[PDB]
Amino acid sequence: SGEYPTVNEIPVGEVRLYQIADGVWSHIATQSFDGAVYPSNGLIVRDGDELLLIDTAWGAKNTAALLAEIEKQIGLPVTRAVSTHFHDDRVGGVDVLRAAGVATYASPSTRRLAEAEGNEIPTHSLEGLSSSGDAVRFGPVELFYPGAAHSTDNLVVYVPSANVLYGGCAVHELSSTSAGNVADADLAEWPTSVERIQKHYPEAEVVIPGHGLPGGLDLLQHTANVVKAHKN
Ligand SMILES: C[C@@H](c1cccc2c(-c3ccc(CS(C)(=O)=O)c(F)c3)c(C(=O)O)[nH]c12)N1CC2(CN(C(=N)N)C2)OC1=O
Numbered sequence: 651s652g653e654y655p656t657v658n659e660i661p662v663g664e665v666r667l668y669q670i671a672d673g674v675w676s677h678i679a680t681q682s683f684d685g686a687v688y689p690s691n692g693l694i695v696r697d698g699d700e701l702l703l704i705d706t707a708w709g710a711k712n713t714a715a716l717l718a719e720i721e722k723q724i725g726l727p728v729t730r731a732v733s734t735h736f737h738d739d740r741v742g743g744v745d746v747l748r749a750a751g752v753a754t755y756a757s758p759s760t761r762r763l764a765e766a767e768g769n770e771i772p773t774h775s776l777e778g779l780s781s782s783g784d785a786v787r788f789g790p791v792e793l794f795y796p797g798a799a800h801s802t803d804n805l806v807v808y809v810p811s812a813n814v815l816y817g818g819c820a821v822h823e824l825s826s827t828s829a830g831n832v833a834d835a836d837l838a839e840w841p842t843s844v845e846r847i848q849k850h851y852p853e854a855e856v857v858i859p860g861h862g863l864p865g866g867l868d869l870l871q872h873t874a875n876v877v878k879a880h881k882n
């Protein structure tokens with residue numbers, strides 16, 4: 651009833667949206683992995699009379715439910731999607747999106763890693779993002795490659811109209827106690843990559859992590875802190 655949703659408040663197999671700013675929503679779904687349940691976030695950004703989607707809802711059925719929830723709550727067509735790294739919480743559901751007429755995009759690095767590891771593969775490559783500090787425009791957002799962090803391919807997304815920074819899985823929520831799933835991470839480079847984000851988006855007003863609750867700029871420093879302590 652207005653609070654940021656968690657696993658306890660999302661009915662089984664469903665998705666919830668949360669209004670972040672004018673024309674900006676997050677999407678929240680839950681999924682089981684290795685016998686535990688986790689929430690995960692994505693982003694929706696109004697693009698005129700269309701919508702840009704950032705990240706799937708972690709799974710085919712969750713992503714179909716996402717599309718239904720968008721139609722119910724917003725009622726504008728999703729025409730493009732960007733996946734911000736190659737893991738299943740970002741690309742799992744790309745096949746559903748593609749069959750629903752959504753053009754799917756990711757960096758060439760993400761596409762290669764998804765293909766090699768057996769995850770679903772976005773159709774279109776996003777050039778211009780291969781060096782840390784690179785930025786490109788994509789509809790109503792800027793895409794930024796901060797360097798290796800949670801994964802070597804992770805992208806962040808900024809919504810300039812609203813000063814919303816979507817960190818994806820390179821950014822953790824304030825309550826986090828460790829650096830999440832570090833299977834593919836570069837813990838030594840991650841603080842440098844977060845520093846780049848801090849330097850590039852100093853006016854961010856809302857910071858959204860890949861999993862958990864949004865907050866302010868403090869999520870960036872907190873992320874650096876938990877990652878350094880994890881590595882240590
Ligand atoms: C789908 C995703 C994932 C699956 C299951 C869980 C997660 C988390 C996560 C875990 C705990 C917390 C609470 S916290 C910050 O307090 O620790 C959190 F916020 C996020 C994250 C994230 O951190 O993004 N991703 C997850 N995969 C699976 C994989 C890849 N692989 C191989 N062996 N190959 C493991 O790597 C990874 O990321």
Ligand SMILES: [Zn+2]
Nearest residue numbers: 735737800819
């Ligand atoms: Zn991941």
Ligand SMILES: [Zn+2]
Nearest residue numbers: 739819860861
């Ligand atoms: Zn993640």
